Amino acid sequence: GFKQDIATIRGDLRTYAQDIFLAFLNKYPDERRYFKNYVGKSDQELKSMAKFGDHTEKVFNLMMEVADRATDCVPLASDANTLVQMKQHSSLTTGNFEKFFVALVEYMRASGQSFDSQSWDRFGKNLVSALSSAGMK
Numbered sequence: 001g002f003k004q005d006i007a008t009i010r011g012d013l014r015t016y017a018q019d020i021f022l023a024f025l026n027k028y029p030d031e032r033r034y035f036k037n038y039v040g041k042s043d044q045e046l047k048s049m050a051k052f053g054d055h056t057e058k059v060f061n062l063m064m065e066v067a068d069r070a071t072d073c074v075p076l077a078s079d080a081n082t083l084v085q086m087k088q089h090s091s092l093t094t095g096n097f098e099k100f101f102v103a104l105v106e107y108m109r110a111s112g113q114s115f116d117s118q119s120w121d122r123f124g125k126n127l128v129s130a131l132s133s134a135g136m137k
């Protein structure tokens with residue numbers, strides 16, 4: 001289930017974080033514009049950049065902590081507010097997050113592992129709800 005999936009992802013955080021982030025950019029290539037240092041670089045070049053691995057991992061660490069603090073896939077409003085108030089997210093809208101979760105769930109369904117994809121979809125939907133309540137446009 002969802003709790004085991006958090007354990008699976010955490011066990012190999014950096015690899016899942018890179019693979020899912022690249023799945024997101026590959027599905028929605030226009031989103032790369034938010035990451036000006038990743039524009040024009042192959043996946044192997046990205047992997048050679050310290051900040052690529054560091055910041056994928058940090059994104060997914062925070063995502064796992066928000067997931068683990070949720071009850072039945074309903075995140076804390078305080079966690080949604082963290083995400084809204086981060087200066088790094090100041091020009092995003094909930095659609096950016098929706099696309100991220102669509103890509104994440106698609107990756108899970110294509111992986112051939114027994115992720116609880118329906119729960120990640122629902123968690124994403126509930127997180128998007130919470131981001132808009134916390135003021136994201």
Ligand code: HEM
Nearest residue numbers: 031034035054055058059060062063088089092096097100
């Ligand atoms: C629930 C999903 C997300 C979580 C948990 C999250 C978390 C984070 C965290 C922890 C950082 C800081 C990383 C660091 O400084 O090392 C970060 C930075 C950033 N995030 Fe998010 N983020 C999420 C979704 C998104 C989405 C959808 C976008 C844009 C499409 C985005 C764009 C950015 C950008 C541009 C930065 C700063 C650039 C960078 O660190 O490379 N984030 N995010």
Ligand SMILES: Oc1ccc(Br)cc1
Nearest residue numbers: 021051052055056059
């Ligand atoms: O550097 C970053 C990698 C992945 C997301 Br999503 C945000 C920032």
